[PDB]
Design an enzyme around this catalytic site. Structure first.
Site, PDB file in Angstrom:
ATOM      1  N   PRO A 114      49.492   2.440  51.320  1.00 35.65           N
ATOM      2  CA  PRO A 114      50.040   3.073  50.073  1.00 35.65           C
ATOM      3  C   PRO A 114      51.479   2.647  49.876  1.00 35.65           C
ATOM      4  CG  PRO A 114      48.894   4.752  51.352  1.00 35.65           C
ATOM      5  CD  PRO A 114      48.750   3.463  52.067  1.00 35.65           C
ATOM      6  N   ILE A 161      45.126   3.274  47.482  1.00 41.23           N
ATOM      7  CA  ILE A 161      43.719   2.937  47.230  1.00 41.23           C
ATOM      8  C   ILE A 161      42.956   4.170  47.692  1.00 41.23           C
ATOM      9  CG2 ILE A 161      41.746   1.433  47.858  1.00 41.23           C
ATOM     10  CD1 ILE A 161      44.221  -0.589  48.666  1.00 41.23           C
ATOM     11  N   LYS A 195      46.244   7.747  55.903  1.00 42.37           N
ATOM     12  CA  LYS A 195      46.172   6.308  56.047  1.00 42.37           C
ATOM     13  C   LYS A 195      47.060   5.945  57.231  1.00 42.37           C
ATOM     14  CE  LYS A 195      44.285   5.184  51.957  1.00 42.37           C
ATOM     15  NZ  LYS A 195      43.014   4.440  51.707  1.00 42.37           N
ATOM     16  N   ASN A 199      54.822   9.792  39.472  1.00 44.55           N
ATOM     17  CA  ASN A 199      53.617   9.212  38.854  1.00 44.55           C
ATOM     18  C   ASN A 199      52.645   8.793  39.956  1.00 44.55           C
ATOM     19  OD1 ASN A 199      54.631   9.604  36.326  1.00 44.55           O
ATOM     20  ND2 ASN A 199      55.563   7.610  36.108  1.00 44.55           N
TER      21      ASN A 199
END
EC number: 5.3.2.1
Lengths: 114, 114, 114
Positions: B1, B64, B32, B97
């Protein structure tokens, strides 16, 4: 298309002519005129990758079309190799985000491209 | 990420160890491996939030998977808390965001993750 | 809404008041209150547009709704007119990317808008 590179490599290590090189390489790879190509390189950034501060880069490639499975594979080979060759960034410390933009969401010259 | 923080707080206010701390907290919240976590902090920016120049931050979290309604609330609570405690930015002057990236649109180590 | 401007125009050429003007014009065009508008201007960047280093700008506007083909054309006209008057950037050297964000993908105040 527009290509942004954000990296902790120092400004002195960015080869004079790098932006012109990328412009040219992106024109050939995307098959788009160099007239619509924008390149933005941001060095000296405060960043980590895997928790360390060794050379890394975080990149984005936005294009109207020409984005997808096979193409992004090709772009990733090309762009990781150029960053590895000219900035000396290991390819495993690079992330490239690919964005397929709708032509109505790209403003240019006081209008949009749709 | 990948997590990017853009802020008008000066560089001397970012604590020693902050990017390493973000790396570990994001490893634990997303689940992750820390190896694929990149963090990018951009201080001293020229920004306004609600028409004023009090301390603020504009952030982005790209992953992801592990992006969704309930998960994004937990990330917001964690990340606004850390920004408030470490950088002294009030949570109502922070936007974050969230992007769910398709694996075929993320390039790394010369290929994509598809 | 959040508006980010990256440009190779020097910091000294950005006039006092530009961020407040951008806030006011965004609030009027989009109909969102000034309270939820964040503006970020990043001058002195290393970037090329069409392969040259004349004045240019790469901008992004993110909003929860109020994004569409006809609205984007209107935003583009207003924003390129403001960039041109205040920063003297030709409108054909500006790209503006528009993003309609889902409410669940925007964090604010320790939670999300969903």
């Amino acid at each position: 298309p527009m290509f942004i590179v954000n990296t902790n490599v120092p400004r002195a290590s960015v080869p004079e002519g790098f932006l012109s090189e990328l412009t040219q390489q992106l024109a050939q790879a995307t098959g788009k005129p160099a007239q619509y190509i924008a390149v933005h390189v941001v060095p000296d950034q405060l960043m980590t990758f895997s928790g360390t501060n060794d050379p890394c880069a975080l990149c984005s490639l936005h294009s109207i079309g020409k984005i997808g499975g096979a193409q992004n594979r090709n772009y990733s080979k090309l762009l990781c190799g150029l960053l590895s060759d000219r900035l000396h960034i290991s390819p495993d410390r690079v992330f490239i985000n690919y964005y397929d933009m709708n032509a109505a969401n790209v403003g240019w010259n006081g209008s949009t491209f749709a």
